[PDB]
C-alpha cells in the first residue's frame, strides 16, 4: 500500500487475466474442434449400434453368449476405466469424476467386489497412485484428438480381463458434456449385454460369412473399444467446455481485483500527494 | 447403385454410390451387387477394391467388418488406406501431418499453453502479497 | 557446509511456485523440495535455547549430506533436539573434535568425517 506495489500488484492481476483470456480463447477451441470430432465419430458407432442390436436379437444361447456377452454371476472382481483430463485448470470436473470413482470404488468394494482401475490421464493416474489404487492401467499424455489406437492399449487389457475371468465387469467413469457450461460426470456399464427393444434391432438377420459364434467375437471387442474411444472423445469435450467456463470465471474474478486494486492505487496516489504537498508547505512555512 | 459408406472409428472415409465391391471377406474374396443379399462378413488384411464406372479404386484395408444390406454397404473397417495415391505421403494428407499437424497441431499447442500455465504460476507467486 | 544450505533454500523458494499448484511435479522435485522442506524446519529453533557452532555445524552435516531425508518434517526439530541430547550424552568427543578443528581450510577432514557420520548412523539405529 505505498502506491508504487499496488502498481505492481496491478499489472501482475492484468497479466494474469489476459493469460486467463488467452486460456480460455484457446479452450473454447479445442472445445469445438473436440465437439466435432465426436460428432465425425458418431456414424460409426451408430452403425455398430444397431449392428450389436441386431445380432443379439440373434445367438441368444448364453452358452454362445459366453464370450464377453456373458454376465459373470459372482462379480468378484469389477473394473472402473476412469478418464481424468491430463492438466489441472478444468475446474471441478477433475475432482467430480475422481469422487464418482470413489462413491462407485466404496459402493462395489462395499459388495465385496475386489474394484480395479485403468485411468486415462495423468490427473487420474496421480489421485490413484497416491490413494493406493495404482491404476491396473494408465494411458497419460492424451492429446485433443487421440484415435481409437491410443484407448486400445489399456481395453485390450480390461476385454482380456473379463475374458480370463480376472474380472466380471467393466464400467467406465468419464466426463459427460450435457451444456457448454455442464459436464456432469457419469458412469457407463462396458460389458456388451446389448439386447435393446426388439423395435430397435427389427430383427435385421445377415448370412454371417465367419459364423454367428465367430462374427461375436470378433466384433464384442471392437464395440466395447468403440464405447471407451467414445466416452474418451466425451471426455476431452468436457474438459475443454470446463477449462472454457474456469477461466472465463478466473479473468472476470481478475478483472473484479484489477478495479478495487485500481481503487485502492488511487486512494494511495492522492494520499501521497497530500502528503508531499504538506510536508513541502511545512517546510516553506 | 448402392449405397457404399466406408467408415472408420475416427472419420468417414466415402459416401458415394459405388458399380462393385471386391471385399476381402476372412473365408474367401467376395464381389457385392446393388441388390446383394443382406451379409454381414469380418474382413482379413488386404485390398478392398472399389469399382465405380469403369474406374477401380485399391483401398487397402488392414482389418475391419462389412454389413451389406439390399440397399446399402457399410465397411466398418479398422484401417482404410489408398496406396494408389503414392504422393499421399508428399501430399499434405502426409506430408502436413508431418508439419502442419503433431508438429504444430499438438507440439505447438502443448508448448504455448504449457508456457501460459508457467507464465501464470509464476505472477501468481509474485502477487502472493495482496 | 551452510553453502549447500543456502543453494537449497534458495532453489526451494524458487520451486514454491510449483508446489503451491502443480501435483504432477517429477520426482525429482518432489524430493527437492522435500530437502527444503527439511532444511526449512531444521531453522525452526525455540527461544533461549541457543546452539553452539560446533552443534549447529553437526545438524547442518546431518542435513545437507542426506542422513535426515527418511524423517518426517513434523519431527525434524525434535530430532534434531534429540540428536543433540545424544551428542551430549553418548560422544562429548565429536563435539570436541569439531569444534578444535573449525578453522582449517577443509573442514571435512577424514578424522572428522568419520565418529560424525558413525554418530549420527548410532543415533538413527536408536531412535526409530
Same mark, same amino acid.
Given at each position: ?27 473454447? !477451441? ?10 465425425? +465419430?458418431?456414424?460409426?458407432?451408430? /452403425? ?15 452358452? $454362445? ?11 468378484? !472382481? ?48 496421480? @489421485? ?6 495404482? #491404476? ?58 446389448? !439386447? #435393446?427393444?426388439?423395435?430397435?434391432? +427389427? ?18 471387442? /471392437? ?26 470465471? *478466473? ?35 | 447403385?448402392?449405397?457404399? =459408406? ?38 482379413? #488384411?488386404?485390398? &478392398? ?19 451389406? &444390406? ?5 465397411? %466398418? *473397417? ?9 504422393? =499421399? *505421403?508428399?501430399? =499434405? ?8 499437424? $503433431? ?5 505447438? $499447442? ?7 500455465? %508457467? ?12 | ?6 543453494? =537449497? ?9 510449483? *508446489? ?22 531444521? %531453522?525452526?529453533? #525455540? ?35 534429540? @540428536?543433540?541430547?545424544?551428542? $551430549? ?7 570436541? %573434535? ?31
Amino acid at each position: 500500500p505505498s502506491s508504487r506495489e499496488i502498481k505492481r500488484r496491478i499489472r501482475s492481476v492484468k497479466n494474469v487475466a489476459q493469460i486467463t483470456r488467452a486460456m480460455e480463447m484457446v479452450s473454447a !477451441s479445442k472445445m469445438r474442434r473436440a465437439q466435432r470430432n465426436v460428432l465425425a +465419430t458418431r456414424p460409426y458407432a451408430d /452403425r455398430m449400434r444397431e449392428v450389436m442390436a441386431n445380432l443379439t436379437a440373434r445367438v441368444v444361447g448364453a452358452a $454362445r453368449r459366453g464370450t464377453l456377452l456373458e454376465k459373470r454371476e459372482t462379480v468378484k !472382481s469389477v473394473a472402473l476405466l476412469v478418464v481424468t483430463p491430463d492438466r489441472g485448470l478444468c475446474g471441478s470436473l477433475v475432482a467430480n469424476v475422481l469422487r464418482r470413482a470413489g462413491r462407485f470404488i466404496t459402493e462395489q468394494r462395499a459388495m465385496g467386489r475386489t474394484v480395479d482401475v485403468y485411468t486415462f490421464g495423468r490427473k487420474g493416474r496421480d @489421485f490413484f497412485l497416491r490413494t493406493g489404487f495404482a #491404476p491396473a492401467g494408465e494411458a497419460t499424455r492424451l492429446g485433443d484428438a487421440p484415435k481409437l489406437e491410443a484407448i486400445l492399449g489399456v481395453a485390450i487389457s480390461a476385454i482380456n480381463g473379463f475374458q480370463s475371468g480376472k474380472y466380471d465387469e467393466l464400467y467406465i467413469i468419464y466426463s459427460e458434456f450435457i451444456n457448454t457450461l455442464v459436464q456432469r460426470p457419469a458412469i457407463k456399464q462396458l460389458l456388451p449385454v446389448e !439386447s #435393446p427393444d426388439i423395435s430397435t434391432t +427389427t430383427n435385421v438377420d445377415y448370412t454371417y460369412e465367419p459364423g454367428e459364434e465367430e462374427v461375436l467375437n470378433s466384433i464384442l471387442p /471392437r464395440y466395447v473399444e468403440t464405447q471407451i474411444y467414445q466416452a474418451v472423445l466425451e471426455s476431452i469435450a468436457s474438459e475443454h467446455s470446463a477449462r472454457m467456463v474456469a477461466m472465463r470465471n *478466473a479473468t472476470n474474478n481478475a478483472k473484479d481485483l484489477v478495479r478495487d486494486l485500481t481503487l485502492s492505487f488511487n486512494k494511495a496516489r492522492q494520499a501521497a500527494i497530500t502528503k508531499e504537498v504538506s510536508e513541502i508547505a511545512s517546510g516553506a512555512a | 447403385p448402392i449405397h457404399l =459408406e466406408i467408415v472408420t472409428a475416427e472419420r468417414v472415409i466415402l459416401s458415394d454410390d459405388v458399380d462393385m465391391i471386391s471385399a476381402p471377406t476372412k473365408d474367401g474374396r467376395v464381389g457385392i451387387l446393388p441388390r446383394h443379399a443382406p451379409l454381414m462378413t469380418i474382413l482379413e #488384411p488386404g485390398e &478392398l477394391d472399389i469399382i465405380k464406372n469403369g474406374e477401380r479404386t485399391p483401398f487397402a484395408v488392414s482389418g475391419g467388418f462389412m454389413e451389406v &444390406l439390399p440397399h446399402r454397404v457399410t465397411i %466398418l *473397417a479398422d484401417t482404410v488406406e489408398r496406396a494408389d495415391e503414392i504422393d =499421399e *505421403a508428399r501430399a =499434405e494428407q502426409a506430408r502436413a501431418e508431418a508439419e502442419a499437424r $503433431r508438429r504444430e497441431a499438438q507440439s505447438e $499447442r502443448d508448448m504455448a499453453l504449457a508456457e501460459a500455465k %508457467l507464465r501464470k504460476e509464476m505472477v501468481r507467486l509474485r502477487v502472493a502479497q495482496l | 557446509v551452510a553453502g549447500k544450505l543456502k543453494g =537449497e533454500l534458495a532453489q526451494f523458494r524458487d520451486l514454491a511456485a510449483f *508446489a503451491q499448484f502443480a501435483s504432477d511435479l517429477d520426482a525429482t522435485t518432489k524430493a527437492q523440495i522435500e530437502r527444503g522442506q527439511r532444511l526449512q524446519e531444521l %531453522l525452526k529453533q #525455540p527461544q533461549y535455547q541457543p546452539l553452539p557452532v560446533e552443534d549447529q555445524v553437526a545438524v547442518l552435516y546431518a542435513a545437507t549430506n542426506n542422513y535426515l531425508d527418511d524423517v518426517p518434517v513434523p519431527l525434524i526439530t525434535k530430532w534434531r533436539d534429540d @540428536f543433540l541430547a545424544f551428542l $551430549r550424552t553418548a560422544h562429548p568427543e565429536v563435539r570436541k %573434535l569439531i569444534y578444535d578443528n573449525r578453522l582449517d581450510r577443509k573442514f571435512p577432514t577424514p578424522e572428522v568425517k568419520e565418529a560424525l557420520e558413525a554418530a549420527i548412523k548410532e543415533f538413527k539405529a536408536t531412535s526409530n
